[PDB]
Design a protein around this nucleic acid. Structure first.
Ligand SMILES: Nc1ccn([C@H]2CC[C@@H](COP(=O)(O)OP(=O)(O)OP(=O)(O)O)O2)c(=O)n1
Ligand SMILES: [Mg+2]
Ligand SMILES: [Mn+2]
Length: 539
DNA sequence: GACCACGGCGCC
DNA sequence: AAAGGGCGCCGTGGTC
């Protein structure tokens, strides 16, 4: 290009280089911004941030978070990554976008800046006429990048000392199981090694191999596999317990405390805006969208996430979100009436499994019905359902036949979605967010049908993601007026942090904002709870 | 040290 | 395991 003197002109496309991928832990190595025929490089990166008024370019949110870390108000402007992601959800990284639309993602701030300008021109040029994508960009994604920036920079408080002592506790319980797995095995080995375990269970012990692995075709030792052999030998019962514990200790209990930022005393996740194929968000380093909740030990980990002194956590989750979305998208008179009568499909389905009244269904029994109702909905097999519920295959198939018979309009939408998908080559959400499926007309029955399940799942899951995103955009400005913070987003759940005084008012406000974000043919009811910790905030 | 494929699994 | 979908992270085992 051409060397220009810092600062750059108003609205120059910025390019930056970090020491590591986490903006909260990264050192701003280099900083530059591209203008028409100029490069505008910076001498000192941290001082150069003071000159900028807006971050426009590739990964705009990342630099914004780093600036927001240094107490700087540097909002996220245009981001070509957002443009490419809307053009195609496949475009997830700058490395994949640049080579597709003329350019090369490098490690130079100036060349990264230059790319951001030219990539903008191509992508914004290809976004002409796509008013459904433009509306989804200007009114949702582009504002959301600002909200996510404040969320990542804020972070969530974690009870360090609690998890520390909890680690030593789980440790002794792991050694007990491990010692109780060795004796039955007759010898010691690596329980973490599925290879060594496979030999012990199937070659040494007389246990039957029930499943194979995908890539290598080895005898599987998965949970579902061991679940079937839970009475074939007592060692299997203990392995499942060992699996659960080491899983929680190696993923959450141990890593999370060492992820606390020294200057904030909080946990800072990354909300990837262009990572999923359905339009969902993504949480990484650390993943705060997969904090355990199912098991008792998992709930103990959940309580480690607490509010700041004098503050309270406020959790809001859309009740039966995709089922309501499905009711709006399909227009099933029976399904719409279900919610209009204030029914709970998860509760009734759990009432059928355990053979108990709807009132006898506890919060843990109902949750187990989610994977079944959602499973069956998106093409689960009667075989798989039979084994999970420990019921005969004849009883499992009867559920599916009865499940889709309660609502004789959903399948009309499913085939409609697939047919429209085979014609256009892509399925779209309620707002217009499209996903290109290239195997709807595949010749292989496996490849074709697998692409089909991805095809009609995208509009329902994607719509829910769209509604949540739009809700966050409408809700966030209201938070700053009441001194409230937006902490986490869990697909259909929002975790807020408000002062103890107005914590009640925030919950009532946030609930109403989320319920009326986009009125459908079905009411979008939201369950809200206030607690001193995350687990308490959902009870 | 940085990276990779794989099985496995936590959540939504 | 399998005809549920969407993620990220873990240890193992391995390469460079
Ligand atoms: N095993 C699962 C669980 C969830 N989901 C999707 C469906 C909706 C979305 C979030 O829904 P949840 O909050 O997990 O459950 P729900 O349907 O919203 O019901 P509730 O809010 O009462 O738990 O994630 C899924 O596809 N598969
Ligand atoms: Mg939820
Ligand atoms: Mn929900």
């Amino acid at each position: 290009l051409e060397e220009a003197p810092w600062p750059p002109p108003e609205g120059a496309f910025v390019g930056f280089v970090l020491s590591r991928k986490e903006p909260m832990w990264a050192d701003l190595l280099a900083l530059a911004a591209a203008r028409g025929g100029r490069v505008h490089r910076a001498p000192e990166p941290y001082k150069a941030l003071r000159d900028l008024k807006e971050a426009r370019g590739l990964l705009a949110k990342d630099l914004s978070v780093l600036a927001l870390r240094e107490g700087l108000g540097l909002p996220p402007g245009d981001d070509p990554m957002l443009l490419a992601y809307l053009l195609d959800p496949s475009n997830t990284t700058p490395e994949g976008v640049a080579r597709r639309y003329g350019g090369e993602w490098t490690e130079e701030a100036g060349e990264r800046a230059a790319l951001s300008e030219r990539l903008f021109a191509n992508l914004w040029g290809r976004l002409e006429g796509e008013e459904r994508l433009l509306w989804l960009y200007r009114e949702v994604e582009r504002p959301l990048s600002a909200v996510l920036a404040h969320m990542e920079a804020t972070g969530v408080r974690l009870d360090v000392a609690y998890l520390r002592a909890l680690s030593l506790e789980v440790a002794e319980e792991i050694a007990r199981l491990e010692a109780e797995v060795f004796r039955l095995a007759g010898h010691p080995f690596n329980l973490n090694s599925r290879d060594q375990l496979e030999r012990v269970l199937f070659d040494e012990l007389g246990l039957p191999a029930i499943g194979k692995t995908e890539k290598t075709g080895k005898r599987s030792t998965s949970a579902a596999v061991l679940e079937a052999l839970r009475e074939a030998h007592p060692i299997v019962e203990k392995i499942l317990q060992y699996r659960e514990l080491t899983k929680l200790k190696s993923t959450y209990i141990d890593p999370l405390p060492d992820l606390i930022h020294p200057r904030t005393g909080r946990l800072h996740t990354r909300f990837n805006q262009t990572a999923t194929a359905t339009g969902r968000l993504s949480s990484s380093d650390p993943n705060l969208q997969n904090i355990p909740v199912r098991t008792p030990l998992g709930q103990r980990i959940r309580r480690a996430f607490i509010a700041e002194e004098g503050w309270l956590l406020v959790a809001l989750d859309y009740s039966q979100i995709e089922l309501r979305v499905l009711a709006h998208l399909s227009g099933d008179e029976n399904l719409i009436r279900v919610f209009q009568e204030g029914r709970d499909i998860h509760t009734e389905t759990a009432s059928w499994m355990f053979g108990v009244p709807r009132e006898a269904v506890d919060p843990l029994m109902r949750r187990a019905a989610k994977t079944i109702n959602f499973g069956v909905l998106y093409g689960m097999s009667a075989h798989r359902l039979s084994q999970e519920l420990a019921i005969p295959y004849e009883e499992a198939q009867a559920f599916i036949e009865r499940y889709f018979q309660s609502f004789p309009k959903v399948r009309a939408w499913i085939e409609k979605t697939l047919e429209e998908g085979r014609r256009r080559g892509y399925v779209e959400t309620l707002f217009g967010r499209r996903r290109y499926v290239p195997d709807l007309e595949a010749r292989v029955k496996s490849v074709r049908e697998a692409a089909e399940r991805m095809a009609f799942n995208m509009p329902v899951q994607g719509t829910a993601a769209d509604l949540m995103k739009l809700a966050m955009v409408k809700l966030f400005p209201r938070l700053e007026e009441m001194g409230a913070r937006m902490l986490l987003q869990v697909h259909d759940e929002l975790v807020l942090e408000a002062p103890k005084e107005r914590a009640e008012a925030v919950a009532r406000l946030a609930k109403e904002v989320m319920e009326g974000v986009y009125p459908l043919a079905v009411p979008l009811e939201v369950e809200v709870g206030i607690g001193e910790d995350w687990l308490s905030a959902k009870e």
